[PDB]
Amino acid sequence: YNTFSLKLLEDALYELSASKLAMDDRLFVIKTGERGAIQFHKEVLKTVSG
Amino acid sequence: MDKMLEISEEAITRYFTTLSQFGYKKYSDVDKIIVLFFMEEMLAGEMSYYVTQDDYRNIVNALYCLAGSTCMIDFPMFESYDTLVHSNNRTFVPRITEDSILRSTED
Amino acid sequence: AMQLWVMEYEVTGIGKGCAMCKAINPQQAEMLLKSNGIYNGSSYLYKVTRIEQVIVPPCNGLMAEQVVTYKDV
Amino acid sequence: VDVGCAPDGAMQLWVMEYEVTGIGKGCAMCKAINPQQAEMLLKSNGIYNGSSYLYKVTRIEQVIVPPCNGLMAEQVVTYKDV
Amino acid sequence: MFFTQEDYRKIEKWLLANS
Amino acid sequence: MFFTQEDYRKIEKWLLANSRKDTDF
Amino acid sequence: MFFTQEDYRKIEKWLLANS
Amino acid sequence: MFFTQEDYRKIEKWLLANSRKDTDF
Amino acid sequence: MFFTQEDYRKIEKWLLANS
Amino acid sequence: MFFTQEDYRKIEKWLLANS
Amino acid sequence: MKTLRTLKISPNAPDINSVWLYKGTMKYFNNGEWETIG
Amino acid sequence: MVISINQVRQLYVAKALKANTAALTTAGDIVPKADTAKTTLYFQSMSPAGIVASDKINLKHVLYAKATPSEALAHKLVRYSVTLDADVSATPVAGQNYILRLAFRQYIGLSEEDQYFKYGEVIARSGMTASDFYKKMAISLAKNLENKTESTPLVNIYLISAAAASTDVPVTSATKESDLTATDYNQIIIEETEQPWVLGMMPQAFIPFTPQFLTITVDGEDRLWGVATVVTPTKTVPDGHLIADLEYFCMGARGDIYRGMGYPNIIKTTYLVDPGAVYDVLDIHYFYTGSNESVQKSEKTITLVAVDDGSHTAMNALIGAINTASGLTIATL
Amino acid sequence: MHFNELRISQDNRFLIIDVSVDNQDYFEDVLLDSIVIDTQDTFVMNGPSDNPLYIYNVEDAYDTQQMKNVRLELNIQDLKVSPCSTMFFVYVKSKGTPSTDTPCGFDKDQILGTVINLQPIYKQTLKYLKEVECDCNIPKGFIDMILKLKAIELCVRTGNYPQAIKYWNKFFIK
Amino acid sequence: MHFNELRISQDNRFLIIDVSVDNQDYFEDVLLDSIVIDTQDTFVMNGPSDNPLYIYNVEDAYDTQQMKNVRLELNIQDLKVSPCSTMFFVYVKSKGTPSTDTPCGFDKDQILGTVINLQPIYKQTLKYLKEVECDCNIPKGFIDMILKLKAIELCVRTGNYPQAIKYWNKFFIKNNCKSPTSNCGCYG
Amino acid sequence: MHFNELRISQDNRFLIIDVSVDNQDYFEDVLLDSIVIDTQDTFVMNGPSDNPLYIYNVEDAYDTQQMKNVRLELNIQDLKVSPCSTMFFVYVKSKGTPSTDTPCGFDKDQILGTVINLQPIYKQTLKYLKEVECDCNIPKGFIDMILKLKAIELCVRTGNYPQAIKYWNKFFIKNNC
Amino acid sequence: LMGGNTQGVPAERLQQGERFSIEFAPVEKELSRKVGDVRFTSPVSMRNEW
């Protein structure tokens, strides 16, 4: 990705989980860094404000 | 109309000509004569104001059942210059052996 | 019980409408709208603007269209 | 009833409601061989066939011809809905 | 020549339009 | 498209039904 | 029928004929 | 092989179908 | 003499080839 | 039919006549 | 279809999901920019 | 690969024509033999280890014999024209994330449920036109779909300038932003690509796809962004691999049923077809019935493959060797 | 006033109408007025009917000798009628007074030309000829079709269009 | 040379003739010489008879496009013949020389075209028209009328004019028609 | 123009065409143009049909009296047709303008030559003669075959080729040779 | 075409890429003959090194 948005991540992880996983099997533990935890924070802060 | 007049006059004149030569005409054809002249006086009277174009269609298409039914009534002839297949008199005249991007051309 | 009739009408002051009846003639196609439609207790509101028969042999065509607008209200 | 229209030999009559975005709402009655072909009549021969992307169709339902007289179908869109 | 109802309707409407 | 006197007579008889005189106001 | 304009002019000419 | 006038007429009548005039562009 | 459609195709195509 | 070349030339000649 | 619950008076752009009020303008976020009414 | 048969199929490669049983000298030649009484047809082919004849076709018991060119055995690689929906927005809006999802439907299995989803995304900015968008999205897909880390080639993506409108400028993951230098880009074409092929172990197959677009907010309502129309194909995969995998199958009817199972101990059957050449295919499908109460028919078919040089020279000369000898009308292609 | 070509296109998609005014010296004042298209459903004896299929007024195209010749090519599918089972009636009008030296009977504003599709008739003739090839016997349906076509020809050339439609609907549609 | 409009007016007044030399440049020089009218009673195998019904020299007029195209509106009462019971032969002679390299046969200085009033023949055929409706029976009158007309048609198109006269005399010489009223019926 | 020899080779492997132009003092300017082969399936009355069996152009072979004589030996099995059950029609064209003193009727550019295999008829006659050798009675099928051959001959000599195709396909099509 | 369809299938639904799946095999009630067939499969393998 060039710029991280959760519209890309929630649709990478819904299309994958709808096609390959069951309903109760859609728990995704994302491994990241310290600067990626704040980048995950800022996009959902733009989403929840929506 | 001015033509139902002619057809009715012809039909009744032929009727009385047959009654002059012979002494008998089929009453199944006197019925057709009665219908024909009754229609013509219907259409050339004070009852011509109650007719729509659909009624005109129906009346004409019902009168055409009487056309060749008997010798008294005949198929009317109108002035016509048409046919089911027409002639092509158009002429071909291209410009100095030229063409368009796809096809030929003329004057 | 002869033909089918699509109507366009106008309930007076309330909005537009589309309808379709089965009647012998459009005088009876307006009769069933004003007597069996939802404006049965206020039947003077119906103002029928266009009645046209459902003739078949196209087999694919629009018959009625009436958009209410933000500027008509 | 086998007239020769595309769906199995019969004529099909449809009611359409739609939401013209930015303009308003409306009813529609059409004869069409499919509900996919019924929304294609609004976008080709409708009032707003020029800006055909405005038609947001919310219902396409079939009208069933009755054996005798009566009011078949009705679709009122009021000024209070809009 | 022959007239129907619709012919008279056209004639009278066209008269009234220009009067 | 020629009209004879009779056709004009039919036009008269149709139009007379629609029009009335001063007294009928 | 499909009346032409000139036919209408004929009709009003002959109606205003008894003017 | 010899062509007479009517063959030529058929040829022109066929070619006229494909072609247009300048005004038709 | 009698032409089929293919004769007309030949004639017209070859004429456009020479134009 | 084959329409050897001189037939095509004849057709051109005729068509180009009233050209 | 996009709710805007608050109105903020500030000389700078407060937030995407509010409505920016300057002295005689009302700018709101649409089409990636601030369009004013009137 | 493995194909279905109407109770048998046997293939003979027609590399050269000799028309007599004494001139069969090198490997892969064919002679369609028949007697003067038009009742028996067989093909004497010179195998790599001697002269081998065919099953004797009884010509009153043929069913169909039709010969197919090599342009009808080429799977056309489909294209998809990814554009901006101009009714939505003529120019890209300066705030939204423009994300395009490619929905692959047969990624490593055969079933439509073995899917794969690959993406490309542009954050559009102020003053970014459509040609600067298509320049910035074809790189954002080439870093994903045409990268050097990926297991298989997924798609071949391209760009089209509006002045040229016919030729494609191909974009790869290594293509920089200064390589694509055009202010008149108007579409992005995503084309299917040729998957790998192994003789007999991995058949020729293709992974299909559909470009699908994600929703952006225009005005206040979340609309779709793009439109994807199927452009007619331009690149076709040749006939070399479908016939090598067909010969490798059909040599096992006349030969060893196992192919290499147990490798100190295999019989190396030499294969004659080139996978780098295009081939014409003729099938004579016949049967057997005895003059008795056993009237049920045993269907058989014979496939003759021959090299195409573009004008179908070797196959139409092979058909003419069968028609005059046997008295069937196999149509010349 | 006459027809140059009045034909349905060989592709069964256009209805070609190419009208012209006669070249004689005393139609100099006469022009072309309109083109009215009627089918076997909407025809009436007294000129064009109401609610016609397609009306055309020729001042609309042009902006005077150009008005003496007109050519139309109507996409039949846009008229919402079947090109194979439709018989078109094409009226034309003049809107112009000829000179006072006209010989009598030539001054007529209106004409008419009937149109049908010859492709179905061609296919029927080919089918009947195929039947004739087998055993060299003439099917009676073939002779019936020939004589009924001749009947419609006679009806058209005599102007008896009602019975012409009756025969058309009864035989060449149903 | 060719015929543009060769017809009798349906009111049984005017024998209409409209001749025009071909527009192709081969025949640019050739011009029309005269128009000779013959009937079945004054017909000869080769060329017009020495006792024709009407002669019209083109050169006794404006003398070039006017000369290349000529039109007549001959009234039949001045000819002292019956419009319906007569079959006219129209001969057109050309004066000039067609330029060389024209294919032969095209350079035919003389052209002939016949004329018949088809309205009374349609009147006869309408009497048997309805036989087509009646199945179970052969429409023998309809077939007979059609074959009678087509005999004349084919014999004309093949140039076998004498047998055409014989068939016309056998079938249609006794045709009747409503003579047009001299007082012009007024309409428009 | 005319045909020198026009037959199928005795080995049932070649279709021999040998054409020559007439020796006349008014046919110097006339040459040979092409050879078109048609069968009973593709034959049409008005000249060679489209999609012909074998089109041959004479200026390819030569590099002017050579143009006035042409000979061919077409391997029939290359034409992909049965040498026994095929009725070849050979058209030839001139590509030349004869002199102006040509007598009326000789300026025919196109000619036509019909070809059949005579071996099957020969073997059929031998079979029928062998049947005759027993009990000295003539089979009726033998007289029928003779008269049917005469019918095809009359049709060919009169130019009525379509009915000749009908008779051939109906009667003589199944032939062993 | 089954289902009582008389007017035919539209030509834009018979294009390249149209996917065809197996529904069932309907037979006539009296004097039917054998239809249908049976479909098989086989898997793959992978590899690694040191």
PDB file of C-alpha atoms in Angstrom, chain M:
ATOM      1  CA  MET M   1     -45.882  13.965 -58.154  1.00  0.00           C
ATOM      2  CA  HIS M   2     -44.417  10.459 -58.027  1.00  0.00           C
ATOM      3  CA  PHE M   3     -42.139   7.994 -56.231  1.00  0.00           C
ATOM      4  CA  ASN M   4     -38.489   7.457 -57.131  1.00  0.00           C
ATOM      5  CA  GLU M   5     -37.902   4.437 -54.894  1.00  0.00           C
ATOM      6  CA  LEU M   6     -40.263   3.111 -52.211  1.00  0.00           C
ATOM      7  CA  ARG M   7     -38.580   0.043 -50.744  1.00  0.00           C
ATOM      8  CA  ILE M   8     -37.755  -1.654 -47.456  1.00  0.00           C
ATOM      9  CA  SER M   9     -34.011  -2.041 -46.978  1.00  0.00           C
ATOM     10  CA  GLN M  10     -32.463  -5.427 -47.725  1.00  0.00           C
ATOM     11  CA  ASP M  11     -31.120  -5.468 -44.150  1.00  0.00           C
ATOM     12  CA  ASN M  12     -34.736  -5.299 -42.867  1.00  0.00           C
ATOM     13  CA  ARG M  13     -33.847  -2.256 -40.736  1.00  0.00           C
ATOM     14  CA  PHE M  14     -34.812   0.832 -42.793  1.00  0.00           C
ATOM     15  CA  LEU M  15     -37.892   1.888 -44.756  1.00  0.00           C
ATOM     16  CA  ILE M  16     -36.664   3.862 -47.764  1.00  0.00           C
ATOM     17  CA  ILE M  17     -38.873   6.677 -49.079  1.00  0.00           C
ATOM     18  CA  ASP M  18     -37.524   8.876 -51.891  1.00  0.00           C
ATOM     19  CA  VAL M  19     -40.232  11.144 -53.302  1.00  0.00           C
ATOM     20  CA  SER M  20     -40.012  13.680 -56.119  1.00  0.00           C
ATOM     21  CA  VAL M  21     -42.259  16.154 -57.914  1.00  0.00           C
ATOM     22  CA  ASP M  22     -42.782  15.661 -61.634  1.00  0.00           C
ATOM     23  CA  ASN M  23     -40.425  17.498 -63.982  1.00  0.00           C
ATOM     24  CA  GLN M  24     -43.115  19.030 -66.203  1.00  0.00           C
ATOM     25  CA  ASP M  25     -43.109  22.798 -66.494  1.00  0.00           C
ATOM     26  CA  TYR M  26     -46.343  23.579 -64.610  1.00  0.00           C
ATOM     27  CA  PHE M  27     -45.406  22.046 -61.251  1.00  0.00           C
ATOM     28  CA  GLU M  28     -42.880  24.858 -60.766  1.00  0.00           C
ATOM     29  CA  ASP M  29     -45.103  26.375 -58.067  1.00  0.00           C
ATOM     30  CA  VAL M  30     -45.839  22.961 -56.505  1.00  0.00           C
ATOM     31  CA  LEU M  31     -43.686  21.605 -53.667  1.00  0.00           C
ATOM     32  CA  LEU M  32     -43.695  18.637 -51.248  1.00  0.00           C
ATOM     33  CA  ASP M  33     -45.713  19.029 -48.041  1.00  0.00           C
ATOM     34  CA  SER M  34     -45.620  16.040 -45.684  1.00  0.00           C
ATOM     35  CA  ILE M  35     -45.157  12.283 -45.360  1.00  0.00           C
ATOM     36  CA  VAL M  36     -47.700  10.261 -43.355  1.00  0.00           C
ATOM     37  CA  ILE M  37     -47.124   6.560 -42.632  1.00  0.00           C
ATOM     38  CA  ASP M  38     -49.993   4.166 -41.900  1.00  0.00           C
ATOM     39  CA  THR M  39     -50.120   0.406 -41.361  1.00  0.00           C
ATOM     40  CA  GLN M  40     -52.786  -2.230 -41.971  1.00  0.00           C
ATOM     41  CA  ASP M  41     -54.259  -1.360 -38.550  1.00  0.00           C
ATOM     42  CA  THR M  42     -54.696   2.428 -38.855  1.00  0.00           C
ATOM     43  CA  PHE M  43     -55.585   2.862 -42.542  1.00  0.00           C
ATOM     44  CA  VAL M  44     -58.699   4.728 -43.644  1.00  0.00           C
ATOM     45  CA  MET M  45     -60.022   5.153 -47.168  1.00  0.00           C
ATOM     46  CA  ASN M  46     -60.440   8.932 -46.851  1.00  0.00           C
ATOM     47  CA  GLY M  47     -56.796   9.960 -46.754  1.00  0.00           C
ATOM     48  CA  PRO M  48     -54.478   9.387 -43.799  1.00  0.00           C
ATOM     49  CA  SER M  49     -56.154   8.427 -40.548  1.00  0.00           C
ATOM     50  CA  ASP M  50     -55.910  10.045 -37.149  1.00  0.00           C
ATOM     51  CA  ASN M  51     -53.237   8.876 -34.637  1.00  0.00           C
ATOM     52  CA  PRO M  52     -50.909   7.893 -37.527  1.00  0.00           C
ATOM     53  CA  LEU M  53     -47.725   5.863 -37.152  1.00  0.00           C
ATOM     54  CA  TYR M  54     -45.282   8.593 -38.211  1.00  0.00           C
ATOM     55  CA  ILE M  55     -45.871  12.133 -39.521  1.00  0.00           C
ATOM     56  CA  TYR M  56     -43.153  14.131 -41.289  1.00  0.00           C
ATOM     57  CA  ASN M  57     -43.202  17.819 -42.263  1.00  0.00           C
ATOM     58  CA  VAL M  58     -40.544  18.770 -44.797  1.00  0.00           C
ATOM     59  CA  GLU M  59     -39.889  22.436 -43.951  1.00  0.00           C
ATOM     60  CA  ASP M  60     -38.316  21.118 -40.745  1.00  0.00           C
ATOM     61  CA  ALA M  61     -35.372  19.503 -42.540  1.00  0.00           C
ATOM     62  CA  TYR M  62     -34.419  22.378 -44.845  1.00  0.00           C
ATOM     63  CA  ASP M  63     -33.547  26.002 -44.084  1.00  0.00           C
ATOM     64  CA  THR M  64     -36.768  26.039 -52.940  1.00  0.00           C
ATOM     65  CA  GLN M  65     -35.638  23.315 -55.345  1.00  0.00           C
ATOM     66  CA  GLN M  66     -34.279  21.357 -52.369  1.00  0.00           C
ATOM     67  CA  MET M  67     -37.900  21.056 -51.186  1.00  0.00           C
ATOM     68  CA  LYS M  68     -39.008  19.446 -54.477  1.00  0.00           C
ATOM     69  CA  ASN M  69     -37.012  16.273 -53.708  1.00  0.00           C
ATOM     70  CA  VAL M  70     -36.961  14.427 -50.384  1.00  0.00           C
ATOM     71  CA  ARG M  71     -35.374  11.213 -49.121  1.00  0.00           C
ATOM     72  CA  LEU M  72     -36.176   9.428 -45.852  1.00  0.00           C
ATOM     73  CA  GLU M  73     -34.709   6.341 -44.170  1.00  0.00           C
ATOM     74  CA  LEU M  74     -36.762   5.392 -41.111  1.00  0.00           C
ATOM     75  CA  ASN M  75     -35.354   2.860 -38.670  1.00  0.00           C
ATOM     76  CA  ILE M  76     -38.329   0.512 -38.536  1.00  0.00           C
ATOM     77  CA  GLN M  77     -37.579  -0.606 -34.970  1.00  0.00           C
ATOM     78  CA  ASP M  78     -37.929   3.025 -33.869  1.00  0.00           C
ATOM     79  CA  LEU M  79     -41.480   2.954 -35.264  1.00  0.00           C
ATOM     80  CA  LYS M  80     -42.236   0.029 -32.899  1.00  0.00           C
ATOM     81  CA  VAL M  81     -43.633  -2.211 -35.658  1.00  0.00           C
ATOM     82  CA  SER M  82     -42.608  -5.563 -37.098  1.00  0.00           C
ATOM     83  CA  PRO M  83     -40.679  -5.149 -40.390  1.00  0.00           C
ATOM     84  CA  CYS M  84     -41.723  -8.634 -41.548  1.00  0.00           C
ATOM     85  CA  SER M  85     -45.484  -8.605 -40.821  1.00  0.00           C
ATOM     86  CA  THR M  86     -46.303  -4.931 -41.505  1.00  0.00           C
ATOM     87  CA  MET M  87     -47.768  -3.329 -44.635  1.00  0.00           C
ATOM     88  CA  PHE M  88     -46.928   0.378 -44.717  1.00  0.00           C
ATOM     89  CA  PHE M  89     -49.007   3.010 -46.515  1.00  0.00           C
ATOM     90  CA  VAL M  90     -47.034   6.132 -47.455  1.00  0.00           C
ATOM     91  CA  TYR M  91     -48.995   9.303 -48.215  1.00  0.00           C
ATOM     92  CA  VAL M  92     -47.502  12.501 -49.636  1.00  0.00           C
ATOM     93  CA  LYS M  93     -48.949  15.987 -50.136  1.00  0.00           C
ATOM     94  CA  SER M  94     -48.124  19.017 -52.257  1.00  0.00           C
ATOM     95  CA  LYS M  95     -49.194  22.364 -50.667  1.00  0.00           C
ATOM     96  CA  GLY M  96     -49.058  24.081 -54.021  1.00  0.00           C
ATOM     97  CA  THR M  97     -51.247  25.333 -56.842  1.00  0.00           C
ATOM     98  CA  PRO M  98     -50.306  24.267 -60.405  1.00  0.00           C
ATOM     99  CA  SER M  99     -50.723  26.615 -63.361  1.00  0.00           C
ATOM    100  CA  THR M 100     -53.985  27.111 -65.255  1.00  0.00           C
ATOM    101  CA  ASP M 101     -52.743  25.129 -68.291  1.00  0.00           C
ATOM    102  CA  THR M 102     -52.778  21.749 -66.527  1.00  0.00           C
ATOM    103  CA  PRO M 103     -54.504  18.937 -68.452  1.00  0.00           C
ATOM    104  CA  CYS M 104     -57.473  17.624 -66.520  1.00  0.00           C
ATOM    105  CA  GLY M 105     -56.971  14.825 -64.014  1.00  0.00           C
ATOM    106  CA  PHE M 106     -53.262  15.540 -63.521  1.00  0.00           C
ATOM    107  CA  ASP M 107     -53.784  18.062 -60.688  1.00  0.00           C
ATOM    108  CA  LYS M 108     -53.902  15.774 -57.649  1.00  0.00           C
ATOM    109  CA  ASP M 109     -52.188  16.776 -54.418  1.00  0.00           C
ATOM    110  CA  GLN M 110     -51.999  13.315 -52.838  1.00  0.00           C
ATOM    111  CA  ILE M 111     -50.554   9.938 -53.817  1.00  0.00           C
ATOM    112  CA  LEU M 112     -50.094   6.618 -52.030  1.00  0.00           C
ATOM    113  CA  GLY M 113     -47.624   3.745 -52.155  1.00  0.00           C
ATOM    114  CA  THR M 114     -47.932   0.373 -50.427  1.00  0.00           C
ATOM    115  CA  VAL M 115     -44.905  -1.393 -48.941  1.00  0.00           C
ATOM    116  CA  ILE M 116     -44.266  -4.951 -47.754  1.00  0.00           C
ATOM    117  CA  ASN M 117     -41.238  -7.123 -47.001  1.00  0.00           C
ATOM    118  CA  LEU M 118     -40.328  -9.512 -49.824  1.00  0.00           C
ATOM    119  CA  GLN M 119     -37.891 -11.559 -47.715  1.00  0.00           C
ATOM    120  CA  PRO M 120     -40.575 -13.825 -46.158  1.00  0.00           C
ATOM    121  CA  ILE M 121     -42.116 -14.349 -49.599  1.00  0.00           C
ATOM    122  CA  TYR M 122     -38.678 -15.207 -50.975  1.00  0.00           C
ATOM    123  CA  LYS M 123     -38.137 -17.721 -48.172  1.00  0.00           C
ATOM    124  CA  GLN M 124     -41.534 -19.321 -48.819  1.00  0.00           C
ATOM    125  CA  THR M 125     -40.769 -19.638 -52.533  1.00  0.00           C
ATOM    126  CA  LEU M 126     -37.397 -21.209 -51.732  1.00  0.00           C
ATOM    127  CA  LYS M 127     -39.042 -23.675 -49.340  1.00  0.00           C
ATOM    128  CA  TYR M 128     -41.657 -24.644 -51.925  1.00  0.00           C
ATOM    129  CA  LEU M 129     -38.974 -25.053 -54.597  1.00  0.00           C
ATOM    130  CA  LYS M 130     -37.080 -27.320 -52.201  1.00  0.00           C
ATOM    131  CA  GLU M 131     -40.269 -29.365 -51.838  1.00  0.00           C
ATOM    132  CA  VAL M 132     -40.602 -29.465 -55.633  1.00  0.00           C
ATOM    133  CA  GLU M 133     -37.055 -30.817 -55.944  1.00  0.00           C
ATOM    134  CA  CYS M 134     -38.201 -33.922 -54.039  1.00  0.00           C
ATOM    135  CA  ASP M 135     -40.259 -36.089 -56.456  1.00  0.00           C
ATOM    136  CA  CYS M 136     -40.931 -33.178 -58.893  1.00  0.00           C
ATOM    137  CA  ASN M 137     -44.517 -32.601 -57.690  1.00  0.00           C
ATOM    138  CA  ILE M 138     -45.902 -29.074 -57.304  1.00  0.00           C
ATOM    139  CA  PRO M 139     -47.288 -28.429 -53.792  1.00  0.00           C
ATOM    140  CA  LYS M 140     -50.717 -26.826 -53.895  1.00  0.00           C
ATOM    141  CA  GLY M 141     -49.709 -24.366 -51.184  1.00  0.00           C
ATOM    142  CA  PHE M 142     -47.221 -22.888 -53.648  1.00  0.00           C
ATOM    143  CA  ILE M 143     -49.903 -22.235 -56.270  1.00  0.00           C
ATOM    144  CA  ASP M 144     -52.205 -20.864 -53.570  1.00  0.00           C
ATOM    145  CA  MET M 145     -49.479 -18.462 -52.431  1.00  0.00           C
ATOM    146  CA  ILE M 146     -48.809 -17.343 -56.009  1.00  0.00           C
ATOM    147  CA  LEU M 147     -52.476 -16.693 -56.752  1.00  0.00           C
ATOM    148  CA  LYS M 148     -53.073 -14.929 -53.431  1.00  0.00           C
ATOM    149  CA  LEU M 149     -50.087 -12.669 -54.083  1.00  0.00           C
ATOM    150  CA  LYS M 150     -51.564 -11.877 -57.495  1.00  0.00           C
ATOM    151  CA  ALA M 151     -54.897 -11.147 -55.800  1.00  0.00           C
ATOM    152  CA  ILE M 152     -53.242  -8.630 -53.478  1.00  0.00           C
ATOM    153  CA  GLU M 153     -51.476  -7.103 -56.493  1.00  0.00           C
ATOM    154  CA  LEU M 154     -54.805  -6.648 -58.269  1.00  0.00           C
ATOM    155  CA  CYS M 155     -56.397  -5.194 -55.138  1.00  0.00           C
ATOM    156  CA  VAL M 156     -53.551  -2.701 -54.720  1.00  0.00           C
ATOM    157  CA  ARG M 157     -53.511  -1.593 -58.362  1.00  0.00           C
ATOM    158  CA  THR M 158     -57.307  -1.209 -58.310  1.00  0.00           C
ATOM    159  CA  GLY M 159     -57.156   0.656 -54.991  1.00  0.00           C
ATOM    160  CA  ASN M 160     -59.225  -1.900 -53.054  1.00  0.00           C
ATOM    161  CA  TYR M 161     -57.029  -1.738 -49.965  1.00  0.00           C
ATOM    162  CA  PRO M 162     -59.624  -3.076 -47.458  1.00  0.00           C
ATOM    163  CA  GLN M 163     -59.908  -6.475 -49.122  1.00  0.00           C
ATOM    164  CA  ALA M 164     -56.150  -6.317 -49.719  1.00  0.00           C
ATOM    165  CA  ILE M 165     -55.548  -6.125 -45.970  1.00  0.00           C
ATOM    166  CA  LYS M 166     -58.141  -8.826 -45.412  1.00  0.00           C
ATOM    167  CA  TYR M 167     -56.178 -11.177 -47.667  1.00  0.00           C
ATOM    168  CA  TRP M 168     -52.845 -10.113 -46.148  1.00  0.00           C
ATOM    169  CA  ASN M 169     -53.959 -10.672 -42.553  1.00  0.00           C
ATOM    170  CA  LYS M 170     -55.778 -13.898 -43.375  1.00  0.00           C
ATOM    171  CA  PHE M 171     -53.014 -15.551 -45.424  1.00  0.00           C
ATOM    172  CA  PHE M 172     -49.552 -13.954 -45.098  1.00  0.00           C
ATOM    173  CA  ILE M 173     -49.564 -13.278 -41.331  1.00  0.00           C
ATOM    174  CA  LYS M 174     -51.716 -15.934 -39.668  1.00  0.00           C
TER     175      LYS M 174
END
